[PDB]
Symmetry: C2
Subunit: 122 residues, 2 copies
């Protein structure tokens, strides 16, 4: 039931200026909901985010008490890509410029994950 | 070689809570390391070049010219920073979550420039 949360993706994008896109994806890399990207950009974003999350989790296993990933952040020249878990089987990927308030983005991404939860429990 | 190893230690020593520093080819080979046994370092070079490679893809699609600058993995109690060093190289640093992000950020940018002469 996570396939129709485009409104939750935009609720996030609309609530933190300088964010451009939010994609909610299965950890195998498939788009479930999205705001801000066209169909092709989203498939691509979801492939990247899931690879980042899986390498992130593997580093935790191979180096640090198998600790869960809190977040992966890619810093590009002109923007940032944030990837965190969004519940079992699921990931949230957000593109935001450096002028984005990262405290506010943190609160918003955390809130989004808790709201997604009832749709994973169907 | 041992010369670069020396610089990797220098970095760990200057930055509290860091535990290791690996310099890697983007194609995933260890060039020098401090604080990981040789097997773990090879794993670090593989995982870090994997992070770099995905971050680079992202740059090409969503960036506007410049390369990925850094990938940070934040785990329960530690952080993995992977910085672009140019010339087919990355710096991968592991640290406990207690490390000072201001200093570590500065020290890593400096190290990337510092090694440059030993890579030519």
């Amino acid at each position: 039931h996570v396939s129709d949360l485009d409104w939750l993706m935009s609720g996030l994008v609309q609530r933190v200026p300088h964010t451009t896109s939010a994609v909610l994806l299965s950890c195998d890399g498939l788009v479930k909901s999205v705001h801000g990207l066209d169909p092709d950009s989203a498939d691509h974003m979801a492939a990247l985010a899931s690879g980042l999350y899986s390498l992130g989790r593997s580093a935790g296993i191979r180096f640090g008490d198998g600790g869960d990933v809190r977040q992966v952040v890619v810093e590009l020249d002109s923007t940032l890509l944030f990837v965190s878990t969004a519940g079992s089987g699921t990931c949230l990927a957000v593109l935001a410029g450096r002028e984005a308030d990262a405290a506010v983005l943190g609160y918003e991404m955390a809130m989004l994950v808790k709201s997604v939860r009832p749709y994973l429990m169907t």
